[PDB]
Amino acid sequence: MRFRPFTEEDLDRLNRLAGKRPVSLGALRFFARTGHSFLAEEGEEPMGFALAQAVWQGEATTVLVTRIEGRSVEALRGLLRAVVKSAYDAGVYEVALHLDPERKELEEALKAEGFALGPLVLAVRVLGSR
């Protein structure tokens, strides 16, 4: 298994991993430009991806993982590691993710790669779409 930046040529591979929530070409292009987004592959079987980006806090920066998908704990862990490395290299202060706690594989991968699930809590208000 390997972890790499994706390009436009990888649109189908990403969408093979994207289930019922497709990644557009526009989204792929934007996330390719961040330097924080990765594709996981076993051979040329796609195995996961992470869409992540830098968000300025006013002094420090956070890298937010907007989306992560993966077919195994191994894929999820390696994607997190690749994101974390890209954050360290950019002098980013922290990496954050909004976790659905039903996703046990992701929860396992997060703990294995040094993420905490507290004490900070996520507050959300969904407004909806037009």
- CATH number for the domain harbouring residue 54: 3.40.630.30
CA dist 126 and 128 (Å) reads 6
SS3 state at 67: strand
CA dist 41 and 9 (Å) reads 14
State which residues form the domain around 58: 1-130
Identify how the structure was determined.
X-ray
**Residue 86 vs residues 5, 58, 62, 104, 130: alpha-carbon distances, Å:** 11, 20, 12, 25, 35
Sign of the Cα torsion 16, 23, 28, 76 reads negative
SS3 state at 122: coil
How many beta carbons lie within 10 A of that of residue 89, not counting itself? 10
Task: Tally the domains of the chain.
Answer: 1
Q: Resolution of this PDB entry, in A? A: 1.7
Buried b / exposed e over 36-46, threshold 16 CB at 10 Å, is: bbbbbbeeeeb
